[PDB]
């Protein structure tokens, strides 16, 4: 559908750093390292090779579309926010705590301080219970 092709182009545009229409191992590695991952050049080759269809060793948008159609057909901004909240809420009590947000930041390669964590929880925490529930998270996350 048109909504999800739009979705997947936006995603592709996050990886295609130079806007040349192809994702390279250099660009995929740059993205993965920004997420606090440490891939080898071999892991990056294996990932590009699974998605590559013409054996040129880079991913164009049609190849990326085929991957997303096989692996993520249903994702929307809404399903993405629900999934992120489930991943962030480590103990599954329906609230993100300061300690859970610290864990998430470390897991995604985001430098943190306790003052930043406190400010983030306080700004998202609409009801003032001290933690961020799903309604609060959606309010914070709807705008890019």
């Amino acid at each position: 559908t048109e909504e999800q092709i739009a979705e997947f182009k936006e995603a592709f545009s996050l990886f295609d750093k130079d806007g040349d229409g192809t994702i390279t191992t250099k660009e995929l590695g740059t993205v993965m390292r920004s997420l606090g991952q440490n891939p080898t050049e071999a892991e990056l080759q294996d990932m590009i090779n699974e998605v590559d269809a013409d054996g040129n060793g880079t991913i164009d948008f049609p190849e990326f579309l085929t991957m997303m159609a096989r692996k993520m057909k249903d994702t929307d901004s809404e399903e993405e926010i629900r999934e992120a909240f489930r991943v962030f809420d480590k103990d599954g009590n329906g609230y993100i705590s300061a300690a859970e947000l610290r864990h998430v930041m470390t897991n995604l390669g985001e430098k943190l301080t306790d003052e930043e964590v406190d400010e983030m929880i306080r700004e998202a925490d609409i009801d003032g219970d001290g933690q961020v529930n799903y309604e609060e998270f959606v309010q914070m996350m709807t705008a890019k």
Binding site: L28, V51, M67, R70, M72, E80, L108, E123, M140, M141
Partner: peptide
């Protein structure tokens, strides 16, 4: 800062896409 919340959601979205390769 709302920018950092937005940035974490975006990082999680890109992690999910990386996982598809």
């Amino acid at each position: 800062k709302k920018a950092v919340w937005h940035k974490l959601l975006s990082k999680q979205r890109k992690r999910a896409v990386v996982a598809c390769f």
